[PDB]
From a paper:
In the methanogenic pathway from CO2 and H2 studied under laboratory conditions, low-potential electrons for CO2 reduction are generated by a flavin-based electron-bifurcation reaction catalysed by heterodisulfide reductase (Hdr) complexed with the associated [NiFe]-hydrogenase (Mvh). Here we report that under nickel-limiting conditions, in [name], F420-dependent electron-donating proteins (Elp) are produced and form a complex with Hdr. The Elp–Hdr complex uses F420H2 for the Hdr reaction, fully substituting Mvh as an electron donor module for FBEB at lower nickel concentrations (<50 nM), at which Mvh production is not detected.
The complex is a dimer, (ElpABC–HdrABC), of heterohexamers.
Residue numbers in the entry:
A (entry chain A), D (entry chain a): 149 to 576
B (entry chain b), F (entry chain B): 1 to 283
C (entry chain c), E (entry chain C): 1 to 185
The structure:
């Protein structure tokens, strides 16, 4: 006997695709997402390589479809606490964290946000954007509902008095949900590598050194800078920008011997977008290999050079020095000139890699899955079962199985939907 | 406690003030410094290690057996000597064939390396065995001095083997220095080599002096009053090389060079004659 | 002046000594087999900024087997062994060990500077690379220390033990030390 | 109304996976394959990167499953001739070429092969292996049936006299099959780039210059050399082997501006396999970028250096010169030494890229699909619909959509199965 | 001799002329913007095999903007314009055009060989880079050809037109030709 | 058929035998060679193109206007002159601003470039307008010669613009040569430059001679009897440079150098006097 219900863990593009494929196939599907809204990392991007098309424009309709699908039960701001049983017979225990806002009553109008006096970081802005203690992470959020962070709320009750739907509930408590499913699809995505430990590059010490994901937020028109790339030091545009490849990847000094597989492309994309916004900006990339392996990627690389005049230096930088004026000198060999260079820049962007998300180990142990040498989840067979696991009834989709771009993750999510549907169609 | 005291060459033969300050300091701390009678050059890794690994290792192993006979750990206040002796110790301990070869060479002397003692740096001993609180207690006069700390390369590197502090951004020497009331001033390329290592000082004096001149320019722009080092090799490079730079290019930095032991003695109210600053070429 | 140079501008098998690469790897430089020529070492190198010394290229040549090019290279002696490169190498290559092994081969090939030989001869004669002088004897006396440090300067037997080690390792012959005359030749 | 039957075109790993996923989901599936047996290029490989596991060992069970599945009708040695209609209502006309062997009676014993006097090249051996005019492409063929090539048969009738099942039919005629399906999955794979036009590298003129795929066949234990890597000139092992990357790819002089995405990895794999078979062999790779982007790939690259001592030269070779003794001099800059090198080798292997298969244009026009810039089939949306096409009811799977490795193709095949099943489950 | 050299072993903004790169690109070398430094050009180069001339590095420097390094480089004049590199470049860079533009800049900077100026002066005086001599005059006479070819050698007006073109383009000033004395300056 | 005849410098001023053989050959073929009165140096691309593009282009445009006034295409027997004139022609035709600049310069001479004629190589004219059959008919004595064909570089390259034959493995010259009964012998690095182009012969004679010496070694190992070229520049390099190599390194190859026109004349029974071998330094 195989229960004909599915659980999808994670609300990124991979989880969204898996859930929509399962629901369109007729299976009732739960989706558990730990953030107040689905979207994952794709919703944070401004544009996507290699087309430079807007990510939100194409992701938001799918998020809406998820939020309105008859066969999908969306549980945001929640986490899987326990998993027991086996294929077709999984008992799952989920803990819905308290929003202190009534999801059924909140319309997401935002008045409570306007009236709140307490400012706090917005997780969606990756440490460079502010919001209020009561917030909506981004205007396209699904569900379009508010959330109160109690570590910052001072219980002023202004939000309570400004809301008209009576949606504010300061007395809300965490809720325990128990569900029964036949299959599980883990689509928990990734986190950007934190380069603070790369002391020679100076992240967290030098003012004008940022990560690629922070740059994504700054370029984004809905970001905290209204889409303007500005120096953190003074709030002015940088005349000179350097990008550094392979930060947090291909590096045994930090125990990260793998390639993060997307950094080269998003580096080139961000460089092109900077040039598009500010044609006078000089942009330079320090790389080891340009890995433009995907469909149209090599053409994207050529275009980075021919069309936008982006400079490529083959050399892994030795150091980033902050000057007194807060400009940055990158000290690096140009291995093709065979000489040491010390070039000055107004901003330096670290091409951070991809790592397993915070809390990956806890969920891995809850389900009982194995992990690969790079810390991501291990598939049943690397050649012929990329989305299966040796735990029957549990499948992998997206960067949960390892670093990769959006189309590869989407293909994996569709495949996992198929593989999970097979046992559920069989019924036993 | 007790610890074998390795002197090297430069401290005992060009800058005995460092040795005298060290002896007085360790006497105040209740640590018995035991002489390593018959000790030789460590030998200097730059020349001997570059020329013949076996000779370098055999001489260092003899130096280590001198302490093994006393049954005490070795204490060195020279980055160069520490690097040489520590590297030889961990090489012979971790490789049986090389230990056999070195002992075969040592048969003539009547000694045998056993791998029974540890090699320790002066700063590491101060930081771990004594601690900052006791050093602070022994201070009699806080110093009003802006100091440029020169770590030197072989104190902390290779960090995989030495494992004392982070080589990129260490703090141990800075904390020891600030215990005296002096201020450790950050300056550009603070961790850069002084240029004297690896035999470069003797092979190409101009290149080594260029290292030193770059470092001195960076220290001067930071407005420091003195340089503090834990390496008589670095000490000599800075001291004599300031004179050599003045003679060659006319640059006049005039920044005093103090070993960490001398700085601690100054903060500890030791007699001026015991510092033997007459040995320093830079006043 | 013509730019023609038939042998310096092309690499063929005649420029390659494979036994040299094998000897270097077997002696502790085996890690040189796997750098991917990222150039972090050169970027970190303080001597590379002011001389023609290129550590990445030394590692590359060692891998290729260009023995004659390496051992005869003056720039090989520009490395101070600061270890910065080795601290940062993403492939964890033991760069300084490779440099020192190459230097040992160069010394065996006769590429030793006279000053380095002088240091060797000082160690042979007195057991110290930097032997004491009269002025320092005076300062040691004046500051309460002994006139001579308790080293090979004080104990002749220790000096004879050091000289026995030097004879047994052949170091005296490496630098051309003549025991009868006490000179270098 | 949507017909609940599917057609899968192509019998490679992608087509096999798509067909098995659809059949296990309960839909009746036709598979059409132009070769006498399914397997595609995967069945030609000896081992697979990055694990060096045997390709046939893991592919053959799936081929058997396809051949015995109740829900799959396998039509090998056949081609789709016409496609009419639309989603859910496709009428497809297939032409089964005459084997001159009765598929129902042939047991694949091979006696006819032993007795045939006419030798001809075996397509499965990629131009370096021979068989008879009546042949079985490889022992694991599905169906395990003989085929007679009439361009070489002399009608001697020895095969008729030796066969005991009466399976030989010299009077067989091509057969027309008409099927009705609701969806189509194009999984037609690729062909290796033919480097004859790269005159400076000398393929087809120099005796000891071979392609990567030829090398795959020679390495394979069931190949025409019994798994021995032998110089074509004299049949002895090569003491020195060079590999050249990016042959037929990343090259505007031949109108191939894209990266073939797998050649770096299979180059390193075959270098490792050569070293394993013959540890004394010296192996050198001429590359531009090492694109080891996949899971475990960067580790595979490191291992190529650390474990096997494979030499890497960063330089795109200018020329391959054949010496009088038939050794080969590769003239190339080492860009990291910054010097020209002329190194001698006993064999040179061209890392040929991937191109659309022969006859791709005809099938594309028959179905009515669009092609991308690189000549492969164009998906409906490069980010969010990688396996769909703008032609409703037609989907893409595997290298048909563009160059990629086996796990990516398998994920695409599973995804296409899901996407095709959705309309068929809906039924309208 | 010391190996110290504080400017030759490091690249900073002071070594870079951006206007030089822009001028080269605008004059027909724009394709230099997009080589990916594969080294096919250097591998194909017959002069690279026997001199220190490295065409890939010339293209690289042109992209970086190292004007002083390029135009003062003697190796720049080792290119025969055989076009082999340009025939093989995978990015379809117009290498020979870049080399010739760099050479024009070098000539404008005064880096002209005396022999090349001699060829220029021969063209100025006679309209031929290789003017006829007496032996060839008689040899032409022997086989029934005219003593002089029907060129600027025969027609003074044609030579006048050529000289007018040379004056109008300033070429006489580029090579330091003195019209009054008919000699080079 | 009529065609303007561009001579250049080296053929008309150092090797008139090539010119005489060409004139006799084209007279036998019914093609009217019309002199380009007042023509000058093309000018040689190596020097003038390297020094000043505008001067090179203006002089070449004047040379082209001579033929334009004559109302005929240009035929050149020199790879160098063909490259110069063909490049100038297509540059001025494909670019209006440069044409305006060049015509502004030319206005002083009373001339105006119009872009009305084509530039054609001697070998291309022979191969296409005449054909191998007619050439074979005109042969009076098949030649028993093993020849090394030197294409040169500027006959076929840049191939994108010239589009005559495949630069890597061409056959046109080989086929024309074998029409005479001579055998074109393959030799190593057959397509390599002779070293004289780009001004290298005058700038660095040793480098250019090294090119020539490499080519001569490869030809000698192939056992050829003579070299055949379609470039008086390459002809001069091989001929004079064999003497220069013999005098410099004491290596004598003694391989005769023949222009393709001279080879055809030899096969066509031309008088020995018409072929001016007295001009050749190599007997
Ligand atoms: C700077 C940058 C730029 C990029 N640009 C591009 C580009 O241009 N084009 C492209 O194709 N790709 C790009 N990528 C790659 C792309 O981001 C990924 O391929 C894609 O986001 C993977 O989606 P996913 O759904 O697998 O994971 P994610 O996007 O990480 O989504 C995972 C979801 O799971 C949730 N989750 C995590 N843990 C739990 C848990 N325990 N319980 C419940 N929910 C959980 C997360 O909160 C999130 O909602 C880029 C990546 C970076 C870092
Ligand atoms: C030398 C080499 C080594 C490789 N090594 C590896 C490796 O180690 N690991 C790895 O993961 N990947 C490897 N790859 C890549 C791998 O081969 C592909 O990812 C994989 O084969 C793609 O499978 P597919 O089913 O999409 O296409 P294919 O394998 O090409 O199969 C397509 C099938 O369709 C059939 N077909 C074609 N046209 C028609 C038509 N008109 N009608 C009917 N049938 C048709 C073909 O005959 C064939 O049976 C390698 C590739 C090469 C060239
Ligand atoms: S809590 Fe009330 S005011 Fe705030 S978004 Fe929801 S409905 Fe609007
Ligand atoms: S009660 Fe909390 S969330 Fe509401 S307005 Fe006050 S601080 Fe903000
Ligand atoms: S994708 Fe590019 S930048 Fe990212 S780790 Fe791999 S090589 Fe480095
Ligand atoms: S840093 Fe390490 S991997 Fe990089 S070039 Fe230097 S030795 Fe090789
Ligand atoms: S150890 Fe030598 S090569 Fe490495 S950074 Fe220091 S000086 Fe340079
Ligand atoms: S045709 Fe007959 S002999 Fe040949 S394989 Fe089939 S059954 Fe066997
Ligand atoms: S009839 Fe044809 S297939 Fe059969 S044995 Fe004869 S040649 Fe071979
Ligand atoms: S995968 Fe590697 S070998 Fe193949 S085209 Fe891309 S870079 Fe070249
Ligand atoms: S061949 Fe072309 S792409 Fe390659 S280095 Fe030379 S100019 Fe650049
Ligand atoms: S054109 Fe110049 S750079 Fe290019 S191959 Fe010929 S000589 Fe070398």
């Amino acid at each position: 006997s195989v229960d004909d219900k599915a659980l999808v863990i994670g609300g990124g593009v991979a989880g969204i695709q898996a859930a929509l494929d399962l629901a369109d196939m007729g299976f009732k599907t739960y989706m558990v997402e730990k953030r107040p809204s689905i979207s994952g990392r794709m919703g944070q991007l401004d544009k996507t390589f290699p087309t430079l098309d807007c990510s939100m424009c194409i992701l938001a309709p799918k998020m809406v479809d998820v939020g309105k699908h008859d066969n999908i039960e969306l549980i945001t701001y929640a986490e899987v606490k326990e998993v027991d049983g086996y294929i077709g017979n999984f008992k799952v225990k989920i803990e819905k964290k308290p929003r202190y806002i009534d999801e059924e009553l909140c319309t997401g109008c935002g008045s409570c946000v306007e009236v709140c006096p307490i400012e706090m970081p917005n997780y969606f802005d990756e440490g460079i954007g502010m919001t209020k203690a009561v917030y909506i992470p981004f205007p396209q959020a699904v569900p379009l509902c508010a959330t109160i962070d109690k570590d910052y709320c001072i219980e002023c009750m202004l939000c309570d008095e400004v809301c008209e739907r009576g949606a504010v509930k300061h007395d809300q408590e965490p809720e325990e949900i128990e569900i029964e499913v036949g299959t599980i699809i883990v689509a928990t995505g990734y986190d950007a590598y934190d380069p603070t430990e790369k002391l020679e590059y100076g992240y967290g010490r030098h003012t004008n050194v940022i990560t690629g994901l922070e740059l994504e937020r700054m370029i984004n028109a809905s970001g905290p800078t209204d889409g303007k790339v500005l120096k953190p030091s003074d709030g002015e545009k940088p005349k000179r920008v350097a990008f550094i490849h392979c930060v947090g990847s291909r590096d045994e000094q930090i125990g990260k011997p793998y390639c993060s597989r997307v950094c080269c492309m998003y580096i080139m994309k961000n460089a092109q977008l900077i040039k598009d916004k500010m044609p006078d900006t000089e942009v330079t990339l320090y790389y080891m290999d340009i890995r433009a392996f995907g469909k149209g990627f090599e053409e994207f690389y050529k275009r980075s050079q021919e069309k936008y005049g982006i400079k490529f230096i083959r050399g892994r930088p030795a150091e980033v020095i902050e000057n007194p004026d807060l400009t940055l000198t990158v000290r690096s060999e140009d291995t093709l000139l065979g000489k040491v260079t010390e070039y000055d820049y107004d901003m330096v962007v670290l091409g951070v890699g991809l790592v397993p998300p915070e809390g990956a180990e806890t969920l891995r142990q809850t389900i009982g899955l194995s992990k690969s040498a790079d810390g991501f989840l291990m598939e049943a067979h690397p050649k012929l079962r990329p989305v299966d696991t040796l735990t029957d009834g549990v499948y992998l989709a997206g960067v949960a199985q390892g670093p990769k771009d959006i189309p590869d993750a989407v293909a994996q999510a569709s495949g996992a939907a198929a593989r999970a549907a097979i046992p559920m169609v069989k019924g036993e | 406690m007790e610890i074998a005291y390795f002197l090297g060459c430069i401290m005992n033969n060009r800058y005995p003030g460092i040795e005298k300050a060290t002896r007085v300091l360790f006497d105040k701390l209740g640590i018995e410094l035991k002489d390593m009678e018959g000790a030789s050059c460590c030998p200097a890794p730059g020349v001997f290690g570059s020329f013949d690994k076996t000779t370098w290792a055999a001489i260092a192993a003899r130096n280590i057996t001198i302490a093994e006979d006393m049954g005490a750990d070795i204490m060195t206040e020279c980055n160069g000597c520490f690097g040489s002796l520590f590297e030889t110790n961990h090489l012979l301990k971790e490789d049986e064939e090389m230990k056999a070869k070195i002992n075969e060479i040592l048969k003539e002397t009547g000694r045998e390396y056993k791998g029974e003692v540890n090699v320790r740096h002066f700063a590491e001993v101060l930081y771990n065995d004594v601690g900052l609180d006791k050093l602070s207690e022994l201070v009699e006069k806080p110093l009003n001095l802006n100091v440029a700390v020169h770590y030197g390369c072989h104190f902390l590197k290779p960090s995989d083997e030495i494992n004392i502090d982070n080589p990129e951004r260490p703090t141990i020497l800075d904390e020891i220095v600030e215990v005296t009331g002096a201020k450790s001033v950050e300056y550009k390329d603070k961790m850069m080599c002084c240029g004297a290592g690896g035999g470069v000082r003797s092979r190409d004096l101009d290149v080594a002096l260029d290292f030193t001149r770059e470092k001195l320019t960076n220290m001067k722009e930071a407005g420091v009053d003195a340089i503090v080092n834990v390496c008589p090799f670095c000490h000599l490079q800075f001291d004599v090389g300031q004179m050599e730079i003045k003679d060659k290019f006319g640059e006049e930095f005039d920044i005093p060079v103090l070993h960490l032991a001398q700085l601690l003695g100054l903060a500890m109210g030791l007699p001026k004659e015991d510092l033997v600053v007459d040995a320093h070429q830079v006043c | 002046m013509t730019l023609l140079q038939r042998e310096e501008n092309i690499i063929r098998k005649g420029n390659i000594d494979k036994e040299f690469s094998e000897k270097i790897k077997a002696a502790g430089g085996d890690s040189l087999e796997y750098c991917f020529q990222c150039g972090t070492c050169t970027g970190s190198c303080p001597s590379g900024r002011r001389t023609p010394y290129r550590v990445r290229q030394i590692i590359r040549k060692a891998n290729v087997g260009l023995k004659d090019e390496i051992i005869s290279d003056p720039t090989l002696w520009m490395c101070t062994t600061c270890y910065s490169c080795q601290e940062r190498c993403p492939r964890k290559v033991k760069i300084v060990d490779v440099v020192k092994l190459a230097r040992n081969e160069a010394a065996k090939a006769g590429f030793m500077a006279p000053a380095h030989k002088a240091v060797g001869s000082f160690v042979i004669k007195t057991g110290h690379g930097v032997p004491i002088n009269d002025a320092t004897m005076e300062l040691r006396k004046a500051v309460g220390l002994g006139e001579l440090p308790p080293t090979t300067h004080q104990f002749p037997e220790a000096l004879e033990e050091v000289q026995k080690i030097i004879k047994a390792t052949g170091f005296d012959q490496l630098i051309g030390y003549n025991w009868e005359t006490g000179e270098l030749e």
